[PDB]
């Protein structure tokens, strides 16, 4: 029972990915301190790809081709996932992707554990409009995830007679110059909501810069599908507060499942790793890989795959399951609002988990 | 009634795209020599983007932003389509894409007139295996269409217990060196079928090179989803013959609809433009844009769009229609085999047009 962990320790998204790696290590901790799997311990491998799609492919290639790894948990940014995908498909291996993403992709060797657009973007557009206004400006990092995410958010805003004023992109490793010319464009647009697909390090700098250009008084909230407690941990409470995020989970949800997961994260994560919805996704997907294998009684991919879709996990977010029709997950969706003191204050929560529909045709979408 | 035509006159795919532009010009010829549309003539615009995704975006931007064009027919290579897409979506314009492509994309402003994977790749994999063998080697040009097409063909081959030996990519503007190292890899692989996603100019050079490395006697056939009469026109009959292609149409089909389209193409295309299935797709989609507008009685996009999905065209290939659930087309699928004298000899034909399913989940696929 060998498991490969593809999560950055350095790079643009080092903080979020460390949060993910740890939720994964914790799932294996408990799966092991439960007799392991087959009385044999599940052992993990880690390599820091530093958020580079070529080092992710190389690392995947080394884990698979040399270490005989057939099961992996990892990747956050979409281009890095796409770089590893050919590798896992050739090798008949399996990869669990614990991150929200743009949709429009299918692979029999990848289990998608974060929300497709219909699970986060769809509920969010309805909440933003029918709560803030209809004018929005998009700002994203310059790669496939923001671009594709804004393509679909384009469609959603129109469907609800909203207006997309601008669509701005900044480098993943942005200079203050970029950040300044961008915020200026956001400032002058006069929008009611700023939709952010800025990931990693630039996230907190973006947020603070917008706050700082606005100064005293009313500035649009920043909505995001990625900002979590990890990025939030890097901002000042007045910069953080009021910002909106949709995630199938937050560290502060009421329930016994959340608290158990939490008080446990607190007793295992190192001080530089934070509890986020993405660590939560890497945690439940890692359990399931365990459970499926106990049930299959083996560490063969076919053996484990057949059981993957028949195990329902009672994850810290709510019950979860993986659809066999597209390899995506039934996930909850929560729209939280950050506190003046930095806590995510859930404002809305989906009545039940949303089934995944990766090919997002907006008119065929349920309307929140 | 102004129509923008985005088709290359020069570049890697100049020959195929010229074939497409002409089928489009011919549709407008007849639509005009029928009283036009509203007694007013439909006039077209053309600009040569030379197969460069940045010149396609620029040209689209100029047609739209300066010439007030809201309707366009154009693009062949997927990256060029993706480059124009943001432009048409912002501008609320409409684009008809008369080309086969990789799937996994949706836009409310793009009408897909060529086959998604389930309409060409799916029937083909079954015909290749259950007729040639199970060992195949993939060779594609180096861009998003071949890569994504081979991703799905990967899945299809496995589903039918076939074996994908190698996956080779060559530049769109390849040097003989590349072509030689590639064919060597194809030669040594010992496959029963070579699946080609090589487009434009390199196509005929690839085909001939493979023939020439093989010499006398048994060499695998080259299957393709793109090779047409335009590329075929550039090869020697012994290099061309035996090669396999799946297209919803061929110039030589038996019917009265094909012959009418054909004898007509012959009296309008200039000698350097050939009759292909892609000129056929640009032709029916251009009629429909006409028809929808007569019916809507106007050249407003909303007006025309509402009628788009209610008109059934009796296209040269068979009856066609555009699905409102995903903007793709019900298309026929034919598997032809080239003559020792260069004619596409249909070998199989789908019992009815295949409905489009752009999000290709192979197990949920009908099995041919």
UniProtKB/Swiss-Prot annotation, chains A, B:
UniProt-listed InterPro entries: AmiC_PBP1 (IPR039570), Leu_Ile_Val-bd (IPR000709), Peripla_BP_I (IPR028082)
Top-level taxon: Bacteria
Keyword line: Kinase, Repressor, Transferase
One Gene Ontology MF term: kinase activity
One Pfam family this sequence matches: Peripla_BP_5
Single GO BP term: regulation of amide catabolic process
Keyword field contains Transferase: yes
Gene3D superfamilies, per the entry: 3.40.50.2300
Subunit note: Homodimer. Forms a complex with AmiR.
PANTHER family in UniProt: ALIPHATIC AMIDASE EXPRESSION-REGULATING PROTEIN (PTHR47628:SF1), PTHR47628
Comment block on domains: Consists of two beta-alpha-beta domains with a central cleft in which the amide binds.
Function summary: Negatively regulates the expression of the aliphatic amidase operon. AmiC functions by inhibiting the action of AmiR at the protein level. It exhibits protein kinase activity.
Protein name per the record: Aliphatic amidase expression-regulating protein
Source organism of this protein record: Pseudomonas aeruginosa (strain ATCC 15692 / DSM 22644 / CIP 104116 / JCM 14847 / LMG 12228 / 1C / PRS 101 / PAO1)
Top-level taxonomy: Bacteria, Pseudomonadati, Pseudomonadota, Gammaproteobacteria, Pseudomonadales
Gene behind the chain: amiC
